[PDB]
């Protein structure tokens, strides 16, 4: 019935976005219950263990907190730094607060970005947390505080809040608890990123999506097979993660192998052979944007 | 930062979605002011011109309409057919109605899809109206009533309402005026799909996206150049639309060529050499995320 990069509706996140201004720094934040969560560097660009002293002397009323979607100006009563985030307790309780959970995202999974500016989500796109704990997104100045999220069943799952943009078009941040993804920090210094490794489960997923939609026999789908052990011994020297990266993803890769009648050993052997050739499918594989769940949930069984 | 497929936030669309049920037919609908819009086949699977009689005898009271996001059940006072859409005038006015407009989409133009079910938007994805007036979308049963939209400055532009899933994984429907995109109708029967043709503007923007994302000199890039006139001849026999398909896109295409320092004649020449769904890029969306 069609296989697309699906995203989660942003209406629930939209009504909770607020703009936060302190001194000359401005960014975004989410207003849950009577608390506003925003990047802690909205009060200044510090480093190390000097954050605890600035939050202790943080002028509560110096925070300009506006919810543009509800037209309310909020008043910060107390400031509590939790990790790399600020929990600003306001007097007003957000009526638009949904059922929510603070859930950490595993590398290789997908989430939806509510890219906001001045407290208003302007764009919405889909990223995948990579093995180097980074995402390849689109963020300009004033996008700090934009949240990555997913929806399950009338409950909103918050996983991300934007902080830093690395020059290789990669981005990093914390969860809604204040813990950075990877060893990166919210400091303007030299930060080395871990070696990029392919999330094999998503490379296999992106291959099955072509086999479901290309309809024509791909000239890159090899006629041989390679086993999981032979692949994992090869993956250690070819920048590929251990397959399977997630046992739950196998249940989807297994349904994809039966609905396409192409065994997973055919895809792994192709991945080994397709290292020499294609990545983008431009005219005449190898990507982590398709997840095994998103492909299987859209495939006819 | 990077170049991504940008979609529009569905918050305004969500608060207006409602569920429309008539007999054993359940689908979605959008609620603007005191009028509800929904596909007419909710009252039955008809064909041709009997719609006028079937709607004139369809009671404004067998319609079950609810807005789940607002938890409000709505009653229909009057029913009117406008094209392939139904106009159900309800008693309550939607307080969550933004400044909206019924703008028709042109071939090659991108739009954000709000895949809804029982009045609740479940998934959001991005499509481009193809030259055969088709969209490669993702809809299951009950997704009828879903809308395709864009946003420009606090104003919502509604372009599409899903009706039909074809054999090939392509979908079709009408605008918000009730007129189908292409020569298709809301009938369960094999329909002739117009011959496919590549939107050269969006294909050109596809190649320009890689030059800004990756290196300045990929392998597939051709070192020679072909003219717009010479390409247009080859396009008439190779299923490529006449370039430029939209003169407005040349503002972005020329800005992308100077930004990437590779002319549009090389891109067109590469497309000829490259000959011997997915993430479709429009020239505006690529140029907007490009620096300077
Ligand atoms: C926020 O909007 C600030 O409120 C901003 C978002 C980035 C700006 C441009 N595109 C974005 O995504 N965040 C920052 O500017 C942060 C500030 C930190 C948390 C103190 N810094 C970066 O994103 C950043 C800094 C540097 C750098 O320096 C030195 C060198 C290389 C990369 C880099 N990224
Ligand atoms: C709506 O939800 C109905 O309210 C439904 C959406 C499709 C269902 C599966 N995936 C979808 O996108 N629409 C239909 O089922 C329509 C109903 C029409 C407008 C009366 N029917 C089709 O889209 C359809 C029917 C047939 C067919 O018959 C016979 C033969 C071949 C293709 C085909 N498409």
Author numbering:
A (entry chain A): 1 to 284, 288 to 304
B (entry chain B): 1 to 276, 289 to 304
Reproduce, without paraphrasing, sentences from the article in which this PDB structure was first reported.
While the spike protein shows extreme diversity and quick adaptation to thwart antibody responses and vaccine effectiveness, the 3C-like main protease (Mpro) has remained relatively conserved. SARS-CoV-2 Mpro also shares the same overall fold and active site with 3C and 3C-like proteases from various coronavirus species and even other viral families. In this work, we report the crystal structures of Mpro from the gamma-CoV SW1 in both apo and inhibitor-bound form, as well as the crystal structure of the delta-CoV HKU15 Mpro in complex with PF-00835231. All four structures were solved with the dimer in the asymmetric unit.
Viral species from the delta genus of coronaviruses have mostly been isolated from birds, but they can also infect mammals, as exemplified by the porcine HKU15. We also determined the inhibitor-bound structure of Mpro to 2.45 Å resolution from the porcine delta-CoV HKU15, and the same inhibitor (PF-00835231) bound to Mpro of SARS-CoV-2 for direct comparison. Another repurposed compound that progressed into clinical trials as lufotrelvir is the hydroxymethylketone-based covalent inhibitor PF-00835231. PF-00835231 bound at the active site of HKU15 Mpro, with the same binding mode observed with SARS-CoV-2. Due to the variation of amino acids at the active sites of the two variants, the degree of packing with the inhibitor varied despite the same binding mode. Interactions with the 180s loop were slightly lower, while those with the conserved Glu165/166 (HKU15/SARS-CoV-2 numbering, respectively) and N141/142 near the P1 group were higher in HKU15 Mpro. In addition to Glu165/166, residues I164/M165 and E188/Q189 had the most extensive interactions with PF-00835231 bound at the active site. There was some variation in the extent of van der Waals interactions of the inhibitor with the active site residues in the two protomers of HKU15 Mpro despite conserved binding mode due to slight rearrangements of the side chains. Overall, the binding mode, as well as the interactions, were largely conserved between the two protomers and the two Mpro variants. Closer analysis of the determined cocrystal structures revealed that the E186/188 in the 180s loop establishes a salt bridge interaction with the side chain of K45 in inhibitor-bound structures of both SW1 and HKU15 Mpro.
